[PDB]
Amino acid sequence: NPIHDRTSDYHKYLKVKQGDSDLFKLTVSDKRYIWYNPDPKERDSYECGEIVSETSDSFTFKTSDGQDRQVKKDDANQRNPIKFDGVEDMSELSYLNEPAVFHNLRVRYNQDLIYTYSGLFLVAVNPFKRIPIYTQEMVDIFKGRRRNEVAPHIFAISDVAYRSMLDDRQNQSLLITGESGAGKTENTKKVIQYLASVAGGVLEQQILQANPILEAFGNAKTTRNNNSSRFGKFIEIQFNNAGFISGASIQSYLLEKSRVVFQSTTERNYHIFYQLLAGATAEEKKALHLAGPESFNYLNQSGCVDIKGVSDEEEFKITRQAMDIVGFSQEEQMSIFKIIAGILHLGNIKFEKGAGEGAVLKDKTALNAASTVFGVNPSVLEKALMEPRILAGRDLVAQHLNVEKSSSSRDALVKALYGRLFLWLVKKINNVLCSERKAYFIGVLDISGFEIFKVNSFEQLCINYTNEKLQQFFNHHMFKVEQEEYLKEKIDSQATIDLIDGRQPPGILALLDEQSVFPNATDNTLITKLHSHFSKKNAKYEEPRFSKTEFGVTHYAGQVMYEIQDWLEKNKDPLQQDLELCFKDSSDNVVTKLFNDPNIASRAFITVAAQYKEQLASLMATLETTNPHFVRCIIPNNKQLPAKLEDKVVLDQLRCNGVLEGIRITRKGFPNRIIYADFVKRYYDLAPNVPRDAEDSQKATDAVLKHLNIDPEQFRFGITKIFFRAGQLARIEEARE
Numbered sequence: 001n002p003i004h005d006r007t008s009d010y011h012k013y014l015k016v017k018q019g020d021s022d023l024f025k026l027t028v029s030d031k032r033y034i035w036y037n038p039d040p041k042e043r044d045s046y047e048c049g050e051i052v053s054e055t056s057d058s059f060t061f062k063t064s065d066g067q068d069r070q071v072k073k074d075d076a077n078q079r080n081p082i083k084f085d086g087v088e089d090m091s092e093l094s095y096l097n098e099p100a101v102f103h104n105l106r107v108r109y110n111q112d113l114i115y116t117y118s119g120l121f122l123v124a125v126n127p128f129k130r131i132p133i134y135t136q137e138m139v140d141i142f143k144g145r146r147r148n149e150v151a152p153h154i155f156a157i158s159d160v161a162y163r164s165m166l167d168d169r170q171n172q173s174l175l176i177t178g179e180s181g182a183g184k185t186e187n188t189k190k191v192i193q194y195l196a197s198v199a200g201g202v203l204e205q206q207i208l209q210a211n212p213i214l215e216a217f218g219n220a221k222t223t224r225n226n227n228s229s230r231f232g233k234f235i236e237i238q239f240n241n242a243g244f245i246s247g248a249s250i251q252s253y254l255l256e257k258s259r260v261v262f263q264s265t266t267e268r269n270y271h272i273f274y275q276l277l278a279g280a281t282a283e284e285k286k287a288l289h290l291a292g293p294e295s296f297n298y299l300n301q302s303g304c305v306d307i308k309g310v311s312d313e314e315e316f317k318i319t320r321q322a323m324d325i326v327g328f329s330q331e332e333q334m335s336i337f338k339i340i341a342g343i344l345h346l347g348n349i350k351f352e353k354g355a356g357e358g359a360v361l362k363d364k365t366a367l368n369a370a371s372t373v374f375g376v377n378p379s380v381l382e383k384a385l386m387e388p389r390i391l392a393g394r395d396l397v398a399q400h401l402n403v404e405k406s407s408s409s410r411d412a413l414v415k416a417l418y419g420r421l422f423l424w425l426v427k428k429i430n431n432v433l434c435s436e437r438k439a440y441f442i443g444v445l446d447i448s449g450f451e452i453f454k455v456n457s458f459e460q461l462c463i464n465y466t467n468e469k470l471q472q473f474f475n476h477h478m479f480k481v482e483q484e485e486y487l488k489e490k491i492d493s494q495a496t497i498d499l500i501d502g503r504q505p506p507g508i509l510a511l512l513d514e515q516s517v518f519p520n521a522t523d524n525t526l527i528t529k530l531h532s533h534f535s536k537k538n539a540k541y542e543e544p545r546f547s548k549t550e551f552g553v554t555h556y557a558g559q560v561m562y563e564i565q566d567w568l569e570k571n572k573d574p575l576q577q578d579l580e581l582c583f584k585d586s587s588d589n590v591v592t593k594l595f596n597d598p599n600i601a602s603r604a605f606i607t608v609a610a611q612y613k614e615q616l617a618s619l620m621a622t623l624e625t626t627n628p629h630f631v632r633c634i635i636p637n638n639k640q641l642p643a644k645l646e647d648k649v650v651l652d653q654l655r656c657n658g659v660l661e662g663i664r665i666t667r668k669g670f671p672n673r674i675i676y677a678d679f680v681k682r683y684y685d686l687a688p689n690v691p692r693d694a695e696d697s698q699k700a701t702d703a704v705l706k707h708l709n710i711d712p713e714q715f716r717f718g719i720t721k722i723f724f725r726a727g728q729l730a731r732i733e734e735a736r737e
């Protein structure tokens with residue numbers, strides 16, 4: 001039994017290695033320590049200083065260097081006793097200060113223990129290297145085990161969700177959030193894998209197979225991750241009342257369409273582009289008019305056309321086969337690629353103007369190329385691009401567009417194609433796997449946590465808006481659960497949210513929506529409306545001292561400065577009607593769907609923001625009906641390196657993600673809640689007349705306490721556990737046998 005076999009890899013890779021002793025004694029020491037910032041500017045960098053003396057009010061300690069300093073006991077960051085180094089739950093620490101928390105995390109990461117609980121959360125730090133704890137044998141071990149019976153692992157929380165589901169006859173949710181490259185996706189895939197195994201394969205296969213299809217089209221190499229998810233997702237894993245997988249459904253959000261037409265240096269476009277160009281038969285290429293990526297504008301601009309340790313051709317085979325599995329007819333497959341192909345060509349169109357001011361097409365090659373694969377009409381396309389008829393009152397007149405404008409329209413078309421296509425694939429897949437008549441589900445949410453970049457635009461507001469809601473959800477959740485526990489033993493975000501989504505008074509989005517109806521409004525009208533309503537008027541809002549295009553929002557994670565550029569266009573997400581027209585006629589069977597199906601070609605008249613808001617509310621509604629599970633995925637550094645855990649990088653995430661807050665709150669009450677028997681077995685020796693093994697654990701606990709003369713205000717007799725305030729258990733742990 002691996003859990004019992006100290007030689008098992010389970011032990012090796014999931015546990016702190018255990019020696020031959022239980023004995024409290026080993027850990028004996030006289031030294032006390034504190035965590036101090038050896039540089040008060042750089043406050044996340046801490047060093048451990050031994051307390052060489054104390055006053056009634058402060059402590060005096062020596063630094064690394066031998067530099068004595070002093071601190072107020074109240075400002076002190078007491079170091080937990082070494083026995084606590086490596087605990088599986090931060091809820092077990094007595095001193096619950098930030099440096100303390102990072103240290104426990106760090107001690108673990110140094111032994112390659114990437115999973116740690118913090119109360120309700122499962123903290124997962126990216127290892128940036130392989131750790132073989134996701135095997136089938138690894139799976140087998142988590143089966144039916146309680147949180148407390150096994151080591152922290154993603155499989156563990158997935159097991160608990162599954163049992164709870166079966167046992168409470170209640171739907172479940174796993175919310176996996178954090179920074180780009182933190183490993184949300186990786187964990188997400190593990191949760192599914194696990195469920196597929198405990199509860200499962202034909203459907204299973206298709207279910208599994210759906211992923212790769214989505215990652216090809218929705219994932220790309222960015223500077224933060226080689227396989228970044230450019231869309232958020234909610235996976236609903238469906239079960240029948242017997243606890244077997246009955247189906248699945250996928251909800252996608254915020255796909256980054258812009259990446260299609262543009263990519264930052266060293267980044268790539270979505271994977272599919274390269275896989276196609278790489279894995280397409282020499283005879284498929286021809287039919288498709290394809291060359292190397294270098295031959296395409298949409299792919300030859302970033303400098304990067306390949307990912308190390310990645311074969312696009314091998315990957316393409318893998319994508320194609322996945323589609324094969326799920327059920328895309330070859331016919332389908334073709335058009336998909338044809339679309340990918342068409343899109344490529346569209347990007348290759350060079351607009352020229354000088355004949356006038358309005359643009360023209362000297363070379364119809366790329367144009368012809370695109371139209372062909374799309375099955376649309378080149379002359380209609382051509383016109384639709386440079387000479388759209390536009391409603392100007394009563395009259396409908398063809399406008400002759402310049403290059404820029406012409407070029408931007410072409411781009412808009414590309415992005416609609418891509419977005420709609422993505423949508424369609426999602427639909428197609430749900431069709432296959434999805435259940436009308438399902439009994440229970442476990443939904444997995446894999447999306448970014450708060451985003452605070454150099455530049456923050458409309459998308460960051462959206463994501464950060466979702467994030468305030470999820471944080472408020474946690475908070476409420478924590479509240480109820482903390483109350484129950486306390487109860488079982490006889491012992492805001494609204495303002496931000498409103499600023500964003502308020503109706504009356506209007507919040508940011510309502511203002512944006514308002515501005516949206518006016519063909520001639522501008523970024524400047526928009527930002528001015530915003531400041532007019534909120535500058536010095538809304539406590540969560542900040543009008544910048546000098547920038548005229550930005551504004552600040554005080555979020556849960558702190559202030560975020562947004563820039564308004566293009567918001568009006570993003571909100572409306574315009575496409576010339578003639579292009580729709582053009583494409584609505586397409587002779588391609590997949591193409592006609594993207595444009596003829598309202599569920600695909602349209603919103604609801606509603607804006608992008610209104611749609612975002614609505615989908616977030618549905619999401620929350622669903623979540624509200626589940627028993628939730630929280631996973632905080634943490635990136636260790638910004639360099640994609642193993643064995644390199646940077647306190648500043650780390651601390652900042654724990655600050656933003658709700659981990660440290662959860663603890664600060666929890667710290668104020670009775671953080672340590674131990675089982676009577678558990679307490680006694682380790683401390684019996686501290687009092688006179690206590691056998692490790694006592695039938696009356698509670699009485700026994702009182703003896704030690706009393707023997708020790710602990711301050712009764714510091715502890716709390718629960719019906720089954722002893723509750724201890726912060727520091728208490730440490731002191732205790734610090735007592736003589």
Ligand SMILES: Nc1ncnc2c1ncn2[C@@H]1O[C@H](COP(=O)(O)OP(=O)(O)NP(=O)(O)O)[C@@H](O)[C@H]1O
Nearest residue numbers: 126129130179180181182183184185186225228229
């Ligand atoms: N447990 C893990 N073991 C090994 N590698 C991992 C693990 N978690 C993540 N990784 C590695 O880190 C990379 C990024 O993980 P990933 O799950 O894709 O991050 P993410 O949070 O989904 N990023 P993003 O989609 O861009 O927001 C992976 O491709 C692996 O290189």
Ligand SMILES: [Mg+2]
Nearest residue numbers: 184185228229
């Ligand atoms: Mg991801």
